[PDB]
Amino acid sequence: LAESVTEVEIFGKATSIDPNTYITWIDKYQAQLVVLSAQIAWSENVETALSSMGGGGDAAPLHSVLSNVEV
């Protein structure tokens, strides 16, 4: 879980993910672990975006998180 989270942080905090490296990461770790790493990365990204959004809607990274999820 530690290693998969380490890789999935690099995956999440990026745009236009290369399918080859993503598929290699998926194959490397177990299904349970892949899903758990995705959940951890998304939760931490949303928490960071909300913390940076303390003032309000100004400089919203939530749109960036949604864009990464769509990608």
Short mmCIF file of the C-alpha atoms (twelve columns), coordinates in Angstrom:
data_MODEL
# 
_entry.id   MODEL 
# 
loop_
_atom_site.group_PDB 
_atom_site.id 
_atom_site.type_symbol 
_atom_site.label_atom_id 
_atom_site.label_alt_id 
_atom_site.label_comp_id 
_atom_site.label_asym_id 
_atom_site.label_seq_id 
_atom_site.Cartn_x 
_atom_site.Cartn_y 
_atom_site.Cartn_z 
_atom_site.pdbx_PDB_model_num 
ATOM 1  C CA . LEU A 1  0.000   0.000  0.000   1 
ATOM 2  C CA . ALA A 2  2.830   2.409  0.803   1 
ATOM 3  C CA . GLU A 3  4.525   1.809  -2.555  1 
ATOM 4  C CA . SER A 4  1.280   1.892  -4.555  1 
ATOM 5  C CA . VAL A 5  0.281   5.153  -2.864  1 
ATOM 6  C CA . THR A 6  3.718   6.553  -3.700  1 
ATOM 7  C CA . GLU A 7  3.178   5.773  -7.389  1 
ATOM 8  C CA . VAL A 8  -0.475  6.855  -7.447  1 
ATOM 9  C CA . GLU A 9  0.396   10.278 -6.025  1 
ATOM 10 C CA . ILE A 10 2.608   10.849 -9.069  1 
ATOM 11 C CA . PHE A 11 -0.203  9.517  -11.258 1 
ATOM 12 C CA . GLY A 12 -2.902  11.728 -9.742  1 
ATOM 13 C CA . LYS A 13 -0.898  14.959 -9.604  1 
ATOM 14 C CA . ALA A 14 -0.460  14.983 -13.386 1 
ATOM 15 C CA . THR A 15 -2.419  15.515 -16.591 1 
ATOM 16 C CA . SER A 16 -2.652  13.367 -19.734 1 
ATOM 17 C CA . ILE A 17 -1.626  10.128 -18.042 1 
ATOM 18 C CA . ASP A 18 0.291   7.820  -20.357 1 
ATOM 19 C CA . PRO A 19 -1.709  4.570  -20.700 1 
ATOM 20 C CA . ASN A 20 1.430   2.402  -20.735 1 
ATOM 21 C CA . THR A 21 2.753   3.402  -17.307 1 
ATOM 22 C CA . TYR A 22 -0.768  3.384  -15.852 1 
ATOM 23 C CA . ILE A 23 -1.350  -0.167 -17.102 1 
ATOM 24 C CA . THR A 24 2.032   -1.271 -15.752 1 
ATOM 25 C CA . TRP A 25 1.111   0.177  -12.352 1 
ATOM 26 C CA . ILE A 26 -2.276  -1.565 -12.460 1 
ATOM 27 C CA . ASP A 27 -0.621  -4.896 -13.269 1 
ATOM 28 C CA . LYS A 28 2.070   -4.415 -10.612 1 
ATOM 29 C CA . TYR A 29 -0.304  -4.215 -7.633  1 
ATOM 30 C CA . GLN A 30 -3.325  -6.246 -6.586  1 
ATOM 31 C CA . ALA A 31 -6.898  -5.243 -7.392  1 
ATOM 32 C CA . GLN A 32 -7.729  -4.428 -3.768  1 
ATOM 33 C CA . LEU A 33 -4.495  -2.462 -3.476  1 
ATOM 34 C CA . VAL A 34 -5.021  -0.609 -6.761  1 
ATOM 35 C CA . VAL A 35 -8.505  0.493  -5.707  1 
ATOM 36 C CA . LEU A 36 -7.304  1.456  -2.220  1 
ATOM 37 C CA . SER A 37 -4.431  3.512  -3.640  1 
ATOM 38 C CA . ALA A 38 -6.827  5.323  -5.972  1 
ATOM 39 C CA . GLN A 39 -9.158  6.085  -3.056  1 
ATOM 40 C CA . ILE A 40 -6.305  7.355  -0.869  1 
ATOM 41 C CA . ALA A 41 -4.937  9.571  -3.639  1 
ATOM 42 C CA . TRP A 42 -8.354  11.046 -4.423  1 
ATOM 43 C CA . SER A 43 -9.162  11.693 -0.761  1 
ATOM 44 C CA . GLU A 44 -5.831  13.411 -0.121  1 
ATOM 45 C CA . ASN A 45 -6.128  15.490 -3.304  1 
ATOM 46 C CA . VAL A 46 -9.635  16.625 -2.346  1 
ATOM 47 C CA . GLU A 47 -8.482  17.443 1.189   1 
ATOM 48 C CA . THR A 48 -5.587  19.512 -0.173  1 
ATOM 49 C CA . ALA A 49 -7.885  21.324 -2.611  1 
ATOM 50 C CA . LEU A 50 -10.377 22.119 0.156   1 
ATOM 51 C CA . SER A 51 -7.614  23.328 2.487   1 
ATOM 52 C CA . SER A 52 -6.251  25.609 -0.240  1 
ATOM 53 C CA . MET A 53 -9.845  26.818 -0.785  1 
ATOM 54 C CA . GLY A 54 -10.265 28.146 2.759   1 
ATOM 55 C CA . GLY A 55 -10.983 31.663 1.535   1 
ATOM 56 C CA . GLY A 56 -13.740 30.444 -0.770  1 
ATOM 57 C CA . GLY A 57 -14.220 29.768 -4.468  1 
ATOM 58 C CA . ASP A 58 -11.137 31.825 -5.328  1 
ATOM 59 C CA . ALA A 59 -8.310  29.743 -6.828  1 
ATOM 60 C CA . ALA A 60 -10.287 26.511 -6.782  1 
ATOM 61 C CA . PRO A 61 -8.240  23.321 -7.333  1 
ATOM 62 C CA . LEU A 62 -11.376 21.159 -7.103  1 
ATOM 63 C CA . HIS A 63 -11.851 21.696 -10.836 1 
ATOM 64 C CA . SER A 64 -8.307  20.390 -11.329 1 
ATOM 65 C CA . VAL A 65 -9.120  17.295 -9.253  1 
ATOM 66 C CA . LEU A 66 -12.255 16.687 -11.319 1 
ATOM 67 C CA . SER A 67 -10.261 17.141 -14.536 1 
ATOM 68 C CA . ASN A 68 -7.686  14.601 -13.350 1 
ATOM 69 C CA . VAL A 69 -10.497 12.175 -12.501 1 
ATOM 70 C CA . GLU A 70 -11.975 12.661 -15.979 1 
ATOM 71 C CA . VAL A 71 -8.571  12.059 -17.591 1 
# 
